[PDB]
């Protein structure tokens, strides 16, 4: 019918009761960056990159 | 006038008497080697080495 929860998980009240969503807590919006420069040259006698 | 040397430096004869030339003993004829190849190219548009 009904359900009550204590406010602290220990007698000495060092640890409050939560409704923590742990996966939300350990995840985040990631950020990716990427840059690349490339340059090349072609002679009859050689080539370089 | 004259001078005699024992044959071992210790009573128990574990260490013979020598006339060691120590600098000759720790030195040697050294050997040096050296090789180098290099290559280069020149275009109106670039250059490489």
Where are any strands of DSSP class E within B1-49?
A: 41-42, 47-48
Query: What is d(CA A47, CA A20) in angstroms, rounded to the nearest whole number?
Result: 61
Query: What is d(CA A6, CA A18) in angstroms, rounded to the nearest whole number?
Result: 11
Task: Report resolution (Å) to 1 decimal.
Answer: 2.7
Technique employed here was X-ray
Written as six digits, the tokens of A19 are 């409704």
Which chain A positions have a beta carbon within 8 Å of B43's beta carbon? 41, 43, 45-46
Q: Which residues pair with B41 in a beta bridge?
A: B48
Which chain B positions have a beta carbon within 8 Å of A40's beta carbon? none
Q: What does the angle CA A22 – CA A26 – CA A30 come to, to the nearest 5 degrees?
A: 140
Residue B8: which of B36, B16, A16, A25 has the closest Cα? B16
Taking residue A47's Cβ as centre, other Cβ atoms within 10 Å add up to: 13
Which of the 8 DSSP states describes residue B47? E
């Amino acid at each position: 019918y009904g359900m009550t929860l204590s406010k602290y998980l220990d007698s000495k009240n060092t640890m409050p009761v939560a409704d923590t969503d742990w996966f939300d807590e350990i995840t985040r919006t990631g950020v990716i960056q990427q840059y690349n420069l490339s340059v090349s040259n072609g002679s009859e006698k050689g080539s370089s990159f």
